[PDB]
Amino acid sequence: TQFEERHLKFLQQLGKGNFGSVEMCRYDPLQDNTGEVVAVKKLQHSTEEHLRDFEREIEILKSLQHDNIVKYKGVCYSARNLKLIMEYLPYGSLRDYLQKHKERIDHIKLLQYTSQICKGMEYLGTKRYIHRDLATRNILVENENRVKIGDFGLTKVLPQDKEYYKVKEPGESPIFWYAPESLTESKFSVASDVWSFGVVLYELFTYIEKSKSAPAEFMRMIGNDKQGQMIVFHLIELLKNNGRLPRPDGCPDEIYMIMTECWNNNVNQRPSFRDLALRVDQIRDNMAG
Ligand SMILES: Cc1cnc(Nc2ccc(N3CCN(C)CC3)cc2)nc1Nc1cccc(S(=O)(=O)NC(C)(C)C)c1
Ligand SMILES: Cc1cnc(Nc2ccc(N3CCN(C)CC3)cc2)nc1Nc1cccc(S(=O)(=O)NC(C)(C)C)c1
Ligand SMILES: [Cl-]
Numbered sequence: 267t268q269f270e271e272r273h274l275k276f277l278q279q280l281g282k283g284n285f286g287s288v289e290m291c292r293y294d295p296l297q298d299n300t301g302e303v304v305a306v307k308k309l310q311h312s313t314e315e316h317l318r319d320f321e322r323e324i325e326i327l328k329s330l331q332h333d334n335i336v337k338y339k340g341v342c343y344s345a346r347n348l349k350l351i352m353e354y355l356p357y358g359s360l361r362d363y364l365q366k367h368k369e370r371i372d373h374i375k376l377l378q379y380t381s382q383i384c385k386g387m388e389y390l391g392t393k394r395y396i397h398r399d400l401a402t403r404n405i406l407v408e409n410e411n412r413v414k415i416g417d418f419g420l421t422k423v424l425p426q427d428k429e430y431y432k433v434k435e436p437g438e439s440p441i442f443w444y445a446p447e448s449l450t451e452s453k454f455s456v457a458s459d460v461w462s463f464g465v466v467l468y469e470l471f472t473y474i475e476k477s478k479s480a481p482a483e484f485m486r487m488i489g490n491d492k493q494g495q496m497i498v499f500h501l502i503e504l505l506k507n508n509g510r511l512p513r514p515d516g517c518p519d520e521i522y523m524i525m526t527e528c529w530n531n532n533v534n535q536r537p538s539f540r541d542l543a544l545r546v547d548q549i550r551d552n553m554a555g
C-alpha cells in the first residue's frame with residue numbers, strides 16, 4: 267500500500283543507530299487520531315550512497331513473508347526522504363520483554379520463542395540472506411506467544427558462488443558478539459549467524475533466572491543507565507568462566523549443549539537452523555508429554 271508523509275503523526279522514538287532510526291507513528295489520513303500505529307524507519311543522513319543501501323534493505327524485507335519476520339507495510343517517498351513503514355510490535359525487544367515480564371515466563375515459553383527465532387532464521391537462509399547482527403535487541407515481541415526478527419539493516423545477500431560475505435571495511439557496526447572468522451577475516455555467513463544465535467540462546471536462559479540471583483543482583487549493583495550494561499554482565503560471567511560462556515543456572519543440559527555447538531570455532535562444525543528448530547521442538551514436546 268501507499269503512504270503519505272503528511273498523515274504520519276510522530277508519537278515516540280523507538281531506536282536510534284548510526285545510520286537510521288525507528289519511530290512509533292500513527293498513520294492518520296482522517297486526521298481524527300483513529301489511524302493505525304506503525305513503525306517507521308528513516309535515514310539519519312540522506313545521500314545517494316545511504317539511499318541505495320536503504321533501498322536494498324527495503325527490498326530484502328519486502329521479499330520476506332514469515333510469521334517470525336516483522337511485516338512490511340510500505341514506503342513513504344518525497345522525490346527524497348525515503349521512509350520504511352512496518353507493523354508496530356508493542357512489547358519491544360526480547361531483551362527488554364524478558365527483564366520486565368520474567369515473572370510470567372517459564373522454560374516452555376523460552377523454548378517456544380527459541381523455535382520461532384530458529385524458524386525465522388532458517389527461512390532467511392532459504393533466500394540466501396545473512397542477518398549479521400542477530401541479537402535479543404532486534405528480536406521483537408508481538409505478544410506473549412509470538413516473537414519476530416524485526417530489523418534487517420545489516421542483512422546481506424550471499425554471492426551465488428560463495429558461502430560467505432566479506433565486509434571490506436571495519437565500520438561503526440552495532441555487532442558485539444562476533445564469530446571468530448568475522449572478527450579475524452571479516453567473513454559473515456549462515457554459520458556466523460548460528461554463532462550469534464548461541465549467544466541469543468544463552469541470554470534467554472539468563473533473564474529467566476528465578477529471582478534476585480546473578481542477572482538481577484548485577485543490574486541492581488550498577489550505578490548507570492541501560493542497554494550497554496547487559497554486555498558488561500556477560501563479559502564478567504565470561505571472565506569468571508575462563509573465556510567461555512557458562513551454563514545459566516537452571517538451564518537444561520540439552521539447551522547448553524546446543525549453545526556449546528553454536529560456539530564451535532570451526533565454520534563447518536556449527537549446527538543448521540533447520541536442525542536447531544527440530545531439536546528445540548523435541549525438547550518442548552518432552553516437557554509437555
Ligand atoms: C519494526 C519495529 C516494530 N516494533 C517495534 N517495537 C518497539 C521497539 C523498541 C521498544 N523499546 C524502545 C526502547 N525502550 C525505551 C523500551 C521500548 C518498544 C517497541 N520496533 C521496531 N523496530 C525497532 C525499534 C527500535 C530498535 C530497533 S533495532 O533493531 O535495535 N535497530 C535500530 C533502529 C536501533 C538501529 C528496531
Ligand atoms: C567487539 C569485539 C572486538 N574485539 C574482540 N576481541 C576479543 C575478545 C575476546 C577474546 N578472547 C576469546 C576468549 N579467549 C579465552 C581469550 C581471548 C579475543 C578477542 N571482541 C569483541 N567482542 C566480543 C567480546 C567477548 C566475546 C566475544 S565472542 O563472541 O566470543 N567472539 C570472539 C572472541 C571469538 C571474537 C566477542
Ligand atoms: Cl562476582
Ligand SMILES: [Zn+2]
Nearest residue numbers: 311312313316
Ligand atoms: Zn552519511
